Amino acid sequence: ERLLFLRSVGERNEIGFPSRFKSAHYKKPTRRHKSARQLISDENKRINALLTKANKLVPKATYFSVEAPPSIRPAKKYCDVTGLKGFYKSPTNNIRYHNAEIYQLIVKPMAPGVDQEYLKLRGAN
């Protein structure tokens, strides 16, 4: 019953290659996977190609123009251990901390390599 219900769901939603929904003519080509990491660089190269051909023309609304300017006001410092207000930053390993005891039993005896995903949250690595 448990292993037979999914068969009923599969045969209820069963569809094939000559389905009634997609069109009669296909001409379907092959398609590269084209992950999202290279897509921003592809658009950057494309818009650089367009501006260099125009240089041999001001952009209006691109992906790199809508994207936010950095803050003018200084960002508030925070302790990376507790999320509290950070007063002190340790000079040995560059982690801000709030009071003495997190420096005693967390910041001092921490393992090497814990720092890199400790500072990955604020992107200080």
Binding site: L6, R7, V9, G10, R12, N13, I15, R20, F21, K22, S23, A24, H25, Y26, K27, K28, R31, H33, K34, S35, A36, R37, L39, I40, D42, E43, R46, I47, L50, L57, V58, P59, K60, A61, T62, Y63, S65, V66, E67, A68, P69, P70, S71, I72, R73, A75, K76, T82, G83, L84, K85, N99, E101, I102, L105, E117, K120, L121, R122, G123
Partner: protein, 442 residues
């Protein structure tokens, strides 16, 4: 008493389909390709009929030797078929395209459509802001070849919800959308979205629950039971709120007078005083910790993160994004742009103040509207009437957007693209209208 969370329960019944006799080929089809969920149905209906997350599995059966395909709500039947769910969204875009074709085939099968030589209905599509040419090219390819649809039109979901809540199409306002993977600010002038002053911050619900995931990994590195993404999503949904003032709330949330009331203990599912040490308050709350109790070491303690993770939108430097905050970006838009001298609001700015709208999937967090009203009263001149409109469910106002747009036939024809215009102008064509993307150049 600590609470215990689980995965959301699977659906006992599968999703029904609409009757095929009620289909007509003249009605358009409204789709919303959201990063989290898919909304599909007709236009004449106002209430939703198909809401499901975008996922698909290839269940290989041993006895029949046939790869079964389970789509959306059909993936919410078994735990193994839920865990093998695959989203088509990779990053803020789509990368695998055949998955989009079979989920569109699933929506067309479950809409009660009996078509011939492709779908005879024009489609209504939402798209992200400043969308890259390759995915809209592939979109034109798949709809104009695979499905044989007569017409297509496109737009942004935030502007569509703005047009839904301002149905005259000529109002002036400032829309804010908090999506699953991005947060957008668009100033709207006279019913047309001014996209040269639009702003985007790279944070959404997905980055927030990943922040919860690696924050819980960092806070309890010796936790034995790995909890899934759905548990992180549910306890972000149920135990997080926007603080009214993050500077003042952070200096008193570790006191004992708050941790008796504002600490949530979450139990994992399975078969020299501590008063003066803030480590014991931060890790184990205001109750003493016994390391020998079996139920004790299966526990979260949510004390700081509940007000810490919604503050990443207001200060992106916590999340590592070197960007200005939502309040600072709104100050930049409202006080130094559209002919507004800083210290002298123009009439465009005054009209934009009175029609501030918050929408998107990540507006469900409580305390957001009061916080943005407090900030707006903070930086504006005195006496400005600030109005903030928030929907009861701001995850559905986009479908109301294309419903009101395609019900308004007078302005519906200004945005449509037929087969004939695409065939004469290729995939490279930009339809410049009020409620959608503009040209990449001037």
């Amino acid at each position: 008493k600590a609470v215990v969370i689980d995965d959301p329960p699977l659906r006992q019944t599968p999703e029904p389909f609409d009757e095929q006799s009620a289909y007509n080929p003249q009605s358009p089809i409204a789709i919303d390709f959201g990063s989290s969920k898919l909304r599909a149905g007709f236009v004449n209906h106002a209430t939703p009929t198909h809401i499901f997350p975008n996922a698909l599995t290839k269940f290989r059966d041993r006895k029949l030797n046939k790869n079964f395909t389970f789509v959306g709500n059909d993936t919410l039947l078994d735990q193994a078929v839920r865990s093998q769910s695959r989203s088509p969204f990779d990053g803020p875009f789509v990368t695998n395209w055949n998955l989009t074709e079979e989920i569109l085939d699933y929506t067309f099968h479950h809409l009660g459509v009996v078509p011939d030589n492709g779908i005879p209905n024009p489609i209504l599509l939402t798209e992200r802001l400043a969308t890259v040419q390759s995915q809209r090219t592939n979109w034109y390819q798949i709809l104009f070849e695979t499905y044989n649809v007569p017409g297509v039109t496109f737009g942004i979901d935030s502007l569509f919800s703005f047009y839904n809540y301002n149905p005259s199409g000529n109002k002036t306002g400032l829309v804010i959308s908090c999506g699953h993977e991005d947060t957008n600010v668009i100033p709207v002038v006279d019913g047309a979205g001014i996209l040269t002053d639009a702003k985007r911050i790279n944070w959404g619900g997905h980055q927030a629950v990943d922040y919860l995931n690696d924050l819980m990994a960092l806070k309890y590195p010796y936790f034995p039971t790995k909890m899934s993404y759905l548990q992180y999503e549910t306890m972000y949904k149920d135990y997080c709120y926007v603080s009214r003032n993050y500077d003042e709330d952070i200096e008193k949330i570790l006191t004992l007078e708050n941790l008796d009331t504002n600490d949530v203990v979450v139990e994992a599912p399975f078969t020299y005083d501590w008063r003066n040490s803030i480590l014991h308050l931060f890790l184990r709350g205001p109750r003493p910790h016994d390391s020998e109790n079996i139920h004790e070491q299966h526990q979260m303690h949510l004390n700081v993160e509940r007000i810490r993770v919604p503050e990443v939108i207001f200060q992106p430097t916590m999340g590592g994004q070197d960007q200005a905050g939502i309040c600072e970006l709104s100050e930049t838009i409202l006080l130094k742009k559209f002919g507004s001298q800083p210290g002298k609001l123009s009439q465009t700015s005054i009209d934009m103040v009175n029609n501030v709208l918050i929408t998107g999937g990540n507006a469900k967090v409580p305390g957001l509207k009061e916080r943005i009203v407090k900030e707006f009263t903070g930086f504006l001149p005195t006496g400005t009437n600030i109005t903030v409109n928030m929907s009861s469910d701001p995850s559905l106002d986009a479908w109301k957007g294309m419903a009101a747009l395609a019900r308004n036939e007078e302005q519906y024809r200004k945005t449509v693209i037929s087969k004939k215009e695409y065939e004469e102008y290729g995939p490279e064509y930009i339809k410049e209208h009020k409620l959608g993307n503009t040209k990449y150049f001037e």
